[PDB]
Amino acid sequence: FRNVAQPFFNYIEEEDLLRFMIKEEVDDGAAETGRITRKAFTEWVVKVYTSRRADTKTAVKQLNKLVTAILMVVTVVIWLLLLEVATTKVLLFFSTQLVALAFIIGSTCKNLFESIVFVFVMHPYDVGDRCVVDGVAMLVEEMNLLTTVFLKLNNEKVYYPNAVLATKPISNYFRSPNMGETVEFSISFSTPVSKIAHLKERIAEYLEQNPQHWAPVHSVVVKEIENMNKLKMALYSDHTITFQENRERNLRRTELSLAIKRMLEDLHIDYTLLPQDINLT
Amino acid sequence: FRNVAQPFFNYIEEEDLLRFMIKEEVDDGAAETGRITRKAFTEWVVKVYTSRRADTKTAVKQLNKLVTAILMVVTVVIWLLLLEVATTKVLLFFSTQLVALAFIIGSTCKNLFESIVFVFVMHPYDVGDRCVVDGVAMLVEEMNLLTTVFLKLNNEKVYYPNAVLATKPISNYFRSPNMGETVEFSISFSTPVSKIAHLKERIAEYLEQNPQHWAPVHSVVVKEIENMNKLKMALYSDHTITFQENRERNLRRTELSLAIKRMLEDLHIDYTLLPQDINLT
Amino acid sequence: FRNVAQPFFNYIEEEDLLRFMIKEEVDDGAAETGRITRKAFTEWVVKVYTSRRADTKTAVKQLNKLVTAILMVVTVVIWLLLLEVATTKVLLFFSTQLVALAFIIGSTCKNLFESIVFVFVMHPYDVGDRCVVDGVAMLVEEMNLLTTVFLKLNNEKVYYPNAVLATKPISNYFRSPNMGETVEFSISFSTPVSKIAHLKERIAEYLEQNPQHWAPVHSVVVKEIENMNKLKMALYSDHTITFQENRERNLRRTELSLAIKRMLEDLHIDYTLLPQDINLT
Amino acid sequence: FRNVAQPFFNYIEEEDLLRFMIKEEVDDGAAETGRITRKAFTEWVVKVYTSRRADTKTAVKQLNKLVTAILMVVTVVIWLLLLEVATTKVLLFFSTQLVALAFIIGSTCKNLFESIVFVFVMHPYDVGDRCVVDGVAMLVEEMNLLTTVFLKLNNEKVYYPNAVLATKPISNYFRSPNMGETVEFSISFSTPVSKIAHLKERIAEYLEQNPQHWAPVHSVVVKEIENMNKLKMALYSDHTITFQENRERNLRRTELSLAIKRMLEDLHIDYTLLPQDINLT
Amino acid sequence: FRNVAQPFFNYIEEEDLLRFMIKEEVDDGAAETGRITRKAFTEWVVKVYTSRRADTKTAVKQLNKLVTAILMVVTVVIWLLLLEVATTKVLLFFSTQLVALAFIIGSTCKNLFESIVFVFVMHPYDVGDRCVVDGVAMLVEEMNLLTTVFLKLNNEKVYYPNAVLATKPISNYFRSPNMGETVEFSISFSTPVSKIAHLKERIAEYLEQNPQHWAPVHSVVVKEIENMNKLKMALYSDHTITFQENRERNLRRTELSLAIKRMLEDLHIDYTLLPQDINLT
Amino acid sequence: FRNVAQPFFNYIEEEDLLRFMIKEEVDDGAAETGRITRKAFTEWVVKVYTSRRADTKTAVKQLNKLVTAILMVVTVVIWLLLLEVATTKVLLFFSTQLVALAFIIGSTCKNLFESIVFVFVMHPYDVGDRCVVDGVAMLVEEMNLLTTVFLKLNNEKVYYPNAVLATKPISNYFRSPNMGETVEFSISFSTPVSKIAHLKERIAEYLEQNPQHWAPVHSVVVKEIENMNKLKMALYSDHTITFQENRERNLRRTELSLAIKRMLEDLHIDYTLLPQDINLT
Amino acid sequence: FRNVAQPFFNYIEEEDLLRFMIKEEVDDGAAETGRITRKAFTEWVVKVYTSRRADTKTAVKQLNKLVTAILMVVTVVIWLLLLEVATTKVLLFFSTQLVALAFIIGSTCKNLFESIVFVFVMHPYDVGDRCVVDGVAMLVEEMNLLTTVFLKLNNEKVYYPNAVLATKPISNYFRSPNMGETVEFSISFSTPVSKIAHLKERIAEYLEQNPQHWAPVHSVVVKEIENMNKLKMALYSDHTITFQENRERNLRRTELSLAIKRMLEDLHIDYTLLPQDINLT
């Protein structure tokens, strides 16, 4: 309550002035506009009080224009057609055409109301944060009522309709906990298992002495055994950032990869192709 | 019955006070609000008694706000339009616009009611458990009425609409029995069959002496015969956990894989590529 | 007829007691509840007699709760609105809102009625049997009205909505005849045709002396001729089980594969790669 | 006309007995059941005469139960609600709920009527014949009104809904003419063209001396020229069976393939890989 | 005009006999069947004159049965319900059930009317001609109102619903001009360009001396340059037939391919693989 | 204005002859056909004047037949049912069946009106021009109201429904500017960069001395660097034709490809495969 | 306000001339056209004032023709049918046919109103700018109300319907910030890490001395480690243009690629294939 305390008063004088000239007027026309220049301004604070409650400084005011212009009609269309010109003669012709214009504007007022529920109720992002929509990572920079505007990782600008987004799973990197990496690598199946044990102990020591980039808990995983030739391995570890910071994620993971590369060849681990027999005729 | 025993009384005094000033009032207006300041509070306990029956401490109260605000209207709209201002003049104009706002809000009240059936009736998960939605494993951490919030295995946070989830098969790892592994490996077709018999007997002995990780019953399976060169094999066995514990599943299966690797080379089993003839010109 | 012979009587005394105080009452209110505390209990045995006819001990009683609660309304809503408070004043306002709540609950009562036809009329499975839904084999363990609960071959538990299942082809391994195998293998194109004739005669002798696992009728098939190098062959034979018994199917087919492997090398059949010319510069 | 000649008489006595006590009764109630215990039995022979016209001995009688139970209602609901209890008071309340239960049962009476047109009008198969639905060959063994039951080539049993089948192309091997084979093979591009001419003449002689399996007309086709290395060829010929006989088709085509294999090496035709230059450093 | 000149007379005598006993009858019942045993036979020639206009000798008469049986109802249902038993009492009950049976039979009368527009108005084929539906070539042999029956190139018989065909592109080989071939072949990149010029001149001479199979205008096209190793080429030419004649198309194109094969090796053109360096350790 | 100046007169005499015998007739029947043999011929010039405005000489006249036959009904059905036989008795029965035949013919009058907007308003092609629909290039040769008839590049004739085409992107080669080529080629990564500079200067000189086929502006592009082995390059240039002329495009691009081929080997550019180490055991 | 200040006057004289001959006429017909030759010209400035507000000089005037012709009807159809010929006799027959022509023209007035919201409200592009629709880059050159016309990168012209575009994500290169490049390259895993450090320092120096094409900030990224053989790397950098300038983007990136190529071989970096063991028999 900040402005309703002083602006609802501007409807309150007319709430006083429709009780004034009803007793002095009835000791019908000007009697019946005083309650319709009031029925608007009471329908006007139900706007401003149920819209000083609400999730975007662009879409809240593109919404305010929308309910103002449909409550500056259901005042007027009940002023003339329900309070001055007498009822039930033209009151049931415009309701064919009102019902007729909901074969035209009906499906696109359906998409406007599903976009208001996506933006204000479901609310999966704010301006400024990096999101994933199909597998495409995209930064938000404008939220309108019918469209979100995104930037891609190459800075290309995308216009996406909010009613199509309202049926999809959306990721948000800004609202996430600190996120995890994968680095994969392959070694020879005939690596001794004491060298796989020294490799694991040496990975874990690299991550303990870099606490500012990596969390301490990790795992080294064997994923496949191929042709009795190849072990496919992976390392799982945790960042101290999310993937909101795209450039910093790529740089820290480049440096982890080049450190694994150096451990593998201090320990004399490699990979070799399967031998081939040749029958020479 | 805990609070209805003392809060239904707050409707009961008004059930006494509408029988009071009907006899003293009829030895119409204030007669006709006493049954509408009652018709609400009887429609209010049908809320609180059919909602102290119900499957989320966030969604039960986001639901309570929803039926409270539509039963704080079908009290008022039958107070004014069916109990004070006399009927059948404005009683059949608002029902065009009521029918008109179900070309707007109709499809999105359809998705709100399908999301309430998914959450409270179908109920496939609770907060805290790991689920699979397309092939993506995802931990639940917030259940709302229109959206479930998930975390992925890299801790990325996903906002998924509940009306799209209500048409899909959903797995739940927490509600499962103890789950099974597969480890695949390939050996040479000309492996003698006494070495395949020693391999099977040595696999089964590893699983019997590790009862805390593996169940005793398992099977070793030949899946293909390729080019008279390669036998493709698999081992099926059972965990003593489900896949809810993701990090522990990967670690126990890494250790099973490195044990198969060591059996295969104690028994001198290998795999070799097919020979090649060379005609040298 | 077991309980209807003694429980329809509890409606029959009220069928006697509405003919009693109609003659003593007419030598309107208490006259008009005696036929509505009867119209329920006659609408109650049409429940219990057309539901002691029916295909799940969980879904029959989750269904009984559903028709009981809509026949404990179309008693009451014709008691008050068609037998006590006089007609055609409020009788045509609630039928806007009744028609209004079929933009909300209408599509989800459509899916409830398609799920009752799938479960009770189409009836493709029972609890306990192994089924195939897309290519995924799945054991049934709970049939509800809106959801079937499955277990996969790794024991992961799946919640599948019955209205999506009602549009798919569903296999049932339990209701099947004894099922057939395929084992494929490849041999060299320049295998003499007297060795293919000894191979066929030796396959058929293995299947005749194992009658407890294999049926006698089978076929050995040539499927492709490749590059004048490779014959792709298959063996088709029949189990004495269905694929309901998953672990036993895999074990018996592993033993057939290792027996083919031993026939092929008693007969000196192999496969070789195409030769290569080398021009040495 | 076999049973209608003697069973329409059982409506004819009541056609005589409603003309009897209309003149002796009018020299209203028992007058108005005599034409409704008649209006059924005339609506009963329009059943039995337009259903002794009709394409399955299971589905004709699952259909007879269906129209009997909706003509044992539109007798009764015009007996009570249009011939005894006087009109236009309850005659326009049940038609809200009748219109209400076509938001529930309406889409599933839509699928029941599309399944009756598929089974009886479109009629693409009978019980006992082998059909192809997506590329899957399937034998029919039960035709119901809502589901067809199939067996696959491994004897797995499939339950397929008839309303999904009614939108697909369906093949029928039993209703087909005698069907054609393809056998493909590859030869060397530098095969002389007099050897391709002897091969064609020797294929055609094999098919003339086996008239009981193969038709005489055939074609030998060159499909591609690859890398100036490989000619891809095919032989097209005709069976004296359809593919209804699955096991016999596979056996006769295995024997054609092994005969092509023997012609190719009597004529000294082969295939060789492209040569390779080696620069030895 | 052949039969309407003598069969419209059989309605004309009743056009004379309803003007006869209206003056002798009015100097109401038998007055009001004479105009309904006329209103049919005038509605009967509007059938036979607007159906002796029309595109299949099976579907025209399966259609004639369909409009005869709905004009042998809208005679009777306006005879009894609009010309004998007096109006507006039962005239507005059957129109609930008439409106009710268009939730049942409505979607399948929608597919019957879209199939009549496909067959008679869009008309993309006749019986006997070879068509392409997805990439599958198929000969037409029966056109019904709801289904077309096809044969494939292996003589398998397909039942295809006409309402699914009405949304697809359909090719017709019989209605086409004479159609074109492609033969592809690959040569070595280091082929001199005077040999590519002799090859083109020798292709064009083969096509000029075979005018009965090939049109004179053609083109020889270079499609790719690969790895400075391979030129991918094609020859485009024209048949003197369409692809309706499937067996003759395959035979003439086999003979063109074997002639290209012989030109290429008279001109000493070939293709060779890229050389390989070997470092021998 | 050419024929409306003399043919609207044939309605004008009847505009004079309905004002004639209204004063001599009223100093009701023949009074009420003179305004309905007029209401047609005024509704007839609104046809011929709003259809001498309109984009196909086949579809304009297949359209003229369509609006003539629905304005030769809404003359007659307001002649008999609104100007001779008196109103509001049969005026509200045919409007059930009129509303009934829009469950039958309603969806196919929806596709007829979307096809008229595609053909006359959207208008993406004319007869005679080459278009691309999915990636298939197709020449137009007949435009009807419900179907376009195309020819493919092999002269196969396609019947495509206009309501499916109205939802797709359609290319038009005839309405295009002069179109561009791509020729790709690969060279060795260790090509010196002075040879890539001479190649570019020699490409550009070929295009300047052939101005009748190629525009002067072009670009030579490096697209990938592969394995430090291969540069993948492309040349982009412009035709002086569109791709309407299919045979001429293929011939001019064959000659550009064979000219690039000759530049590359005057400059001694090639491509070689990566070397291989051999450890000889 | 430019022309409304002088053209609303042309309605204002008729606003003066309907107040003139109402007092001189009433001291009904010509009284009732003066308010309908006024009701148009007041409905005419609500056109010109709410359309001198509005996003294309072709579509604004193709829109002006559209609302002019539906406000030159809802003047006339309320002139004759609501102000001259008296009401409620023909006032409720044309509203069947008005409701009937919204089974015909209803879905295509739905697509016209969704195309007006795409063009004027969502507004994702203007004429002249390069956009991406599926992955296809396309220059805009005509915006109509129902169709956008595009040119592709080869100058092929595409006609795309605006109602299909209104459901897709659309990129706009003209409205973007300066955009980013990727160049990928592969090096040998056994490259020393001091050579990867000199490569990074030498890349960054090339980008600093070319400020007119490249931004200074960049990153060099290791993406995979393959088989202990290959490092897959990438360089990310920024243009000083967007991809609107297609030809200039390709030329600047060709020159960056040829500069990386020259750094790699000044530093003696390469890539080699994995060695092979040969067992020579």
Side-chain angles (χ1 to χ4, degrees), chain D residues 119-185:
Chain D
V119 174
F120 291 108
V121 175
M122 291 179 171
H123 191 218
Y125 44 72
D126 292 317
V127 166
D129 58 18
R130 203 184 303 276
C131 288
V132 184
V133 178
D134 274 307
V136 190
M138 277 163 159
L139 193 75
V140 180
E141 81 267 358
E142 190 176 1
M143 295 171 70
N144 299 308
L145 257 70
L146 290 172
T147 59
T148 303
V149 186
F150 291 106
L151 297 181
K152 289 187 173 188
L153 289 172
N154 61 351
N155 303 129
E156 167 191 343
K157 172 174 278 188
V158 184
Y159 291 83
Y160 176 77
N162 285 153
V164 180
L165 284 167
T167 65
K168 288 174 182 287
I170 296 163
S171 310
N172 194 336
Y173 287 149
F174 184 76
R175 293 183 189 175
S176 291
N178 294 333
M179 282 175 72
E181 266 316 321
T182 313
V183 175
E184 299 179 4
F185 61 100

Side-chain angles (χ1 to χ4, degrees), chain C residues 73 77 91 109 121 158 191 193 204 220 233 258 264:
Chain C
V73 163
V77 83
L91 196 149
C109 286
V121 175
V158 184
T191 306
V193 85
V220 183
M233 295 183 82
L258 291 173
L264 287 167

Side-chain angles (χ1 to χ4, degrees), chain B residues 170-171 180 191 218 279 281, chain C residues 154 156 159 247 261 276 278:
Chain B
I170 296 163
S171 310
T191 307
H218 63 93
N279 287 305
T281 298
Chain C
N154 61 351
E156 167 191 343
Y159 291 83
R247 184 178 181 264
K261 193 257 199 196
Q276 181 63 252
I278 296 305

Side-chain angles (χ1 to χ4, degrees), chain G residues 29-31 34 79 83-84:
Chain G
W79 177 73
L83 218 58
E84 300 300 332

Side-chain angles (χ1 to χ4, degrees), chain E residues 48 56 59 61-62 83 90 93-95 97 103 116 157-158 167 206-207 223 233 243 249 266 280:
Chain E
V48 310
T56 309
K61 50 163 59 179
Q62 179 178 347
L83 218 58
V90 295
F93 178 69
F94 86 104
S95 169
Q97 301 283 107
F103 291 110
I116 292 168
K157 172 174 278 188
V158 184
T167 65
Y206 180 84
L207 300 174
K223 296 169 79 172
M233 295 183 82
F243 291 175
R249 62 180 295 275
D266 295 333
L280 201 64

